[PDB]
Amino acid sequence: TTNYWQDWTDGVGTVNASNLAGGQYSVSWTNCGNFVVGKGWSTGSPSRVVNYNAGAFSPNGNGYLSLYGWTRSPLIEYYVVDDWGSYRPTGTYMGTVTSDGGTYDIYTATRVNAPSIDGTQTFTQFWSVRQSKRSIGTNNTITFANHVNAWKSHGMNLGSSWAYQIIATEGYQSSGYANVTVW
Incomplete structure (x- = not known):
């Protein structure tokens, strides 16, 4: 079960997220800019098997339902994306992973002087993006280790310092709602 709550906005739009009981969170947003809201663990493990059930993933526009976290050394922002709204995130293609029944494309990207867990840095992004939206309302499982x-196999080794690891709802320039229980 979870131990960490993540509630980040860029101050744009209106983004109301609720830290409900256990691993459950809801988030409603209207004309947001960028927010990353989710539940999970203060410290990410490379072996953790995450489960989640999204009661609603209803973005009106861009929005990701991801396993989301950060390493340091190197500073890496990672996503495992199971659901998205109007735009599927892509990056430099590396290959595919197939875990928990679905096949994900593997992407890398460089963010130049973006906001990061260590301030304004130019950091690196690892991406696992499902090729079709996973089902919502089902008890889903992401085996991270996979x-x-x-990612190791395509040259994408993660950092040594593990920060938080959450089943995040992220929106970018959009509105919508999500109900997700993490455990």
């Missing part, structure tokens, strides 16, 4: 290891 992604971490396949």
Whole structure:
């Protein structure tokens, strides 16, 4: 079960997220800019098997339902994306992972002087993006170890310092709602 709550906005739009009981969170947003809201663990493990059930993933526009976290050394922002709204995130293609029944494309990207867990940095992004939207309302499972290891296989080794690890709802320039229980 979870121990960490993540509630980040860029101050744009209106973004109301609720830290409900256990691993459950809801978030409603209207004309947001960028927010990353989710539940999970203060410290990410490369082996953690995350489960979640999204009661609603109803973005009106861009929005990701991801396993989301950060390493340091190197500073890496990672996503495992199971659901998206109007735009599927892509980056430099590396190959595919296939975990928990679905096949994900593997992407890398560089963010130049973006906001990061260590301030304004130019950091690196590892991406696992499902090729079709996973089902919502079902008890879903992301076996991280699969992604971490396949990322290893394409040259994408993660950092040594593990920060938070959450089943995040992220929106970018959009509105919508999400109800997600993490455990």
